[PDB]
Design a protein around this ligand. Structure first.
Ligand code: 12Q
Length: 128
């Protein structure tokens, strides 16, 4: 029954993630940064994160709340802002997309997540 709650949370998180993942603006965030393509990445960004990995984490029951989930979404975003801070187009584009990923994710959750559902998730997690 609490099990039911987390399963529902997972169903909700997979759907939101799929909707972000098929958005063409967010293509760059769908897969881990390839270390051959970007050799120093794994040096600078201590905690890589991507939408692929977010899917795996959902399935590994790593998110017990929407808060936990959005921490990883924000981490996708802050990684991009930190790794790509320059004034050039390539960096400004990724940053702009990073911010849109973040805001879209929040906006979907704000319209579609019941807050009492979140609150329940939080209270079950707090009791374990
Ligand atoms: C997320 N990201 C970056 O933040 C920087 C370079 C890059 C290259 C290929 C794929 C993803 C990339």
């Amino acid at each position: 029954q609490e099990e039911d709650t987390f399963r529902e949370l997972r169903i909700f998180l997979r759907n939101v993630t799929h909707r972000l993942a098929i958005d063409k603006r967010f293509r760059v965030f769908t897969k881990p940064v390839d270390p051959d393509e970007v050799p120093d990445y794994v040096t600078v960004i201590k905690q890589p994160m991507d939408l692929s990995s977010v899917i795996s984490k959902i399935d590994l029951h790593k998110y017990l709340t929407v808060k936990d989930y959005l921490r990883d979404i924000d981490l996708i975003c802050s990684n991009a802002l930190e790794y790509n801070p320059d004034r050039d187009p390539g960096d400004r584009l990724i940053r702009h997309r990073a911010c849109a990923l973040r805001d879209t994710a929040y906006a979907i959750i704000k319209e579609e997540l019941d807050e009492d559902f979140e609150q329940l998730c939080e209270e079950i997690q707090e009791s374990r």
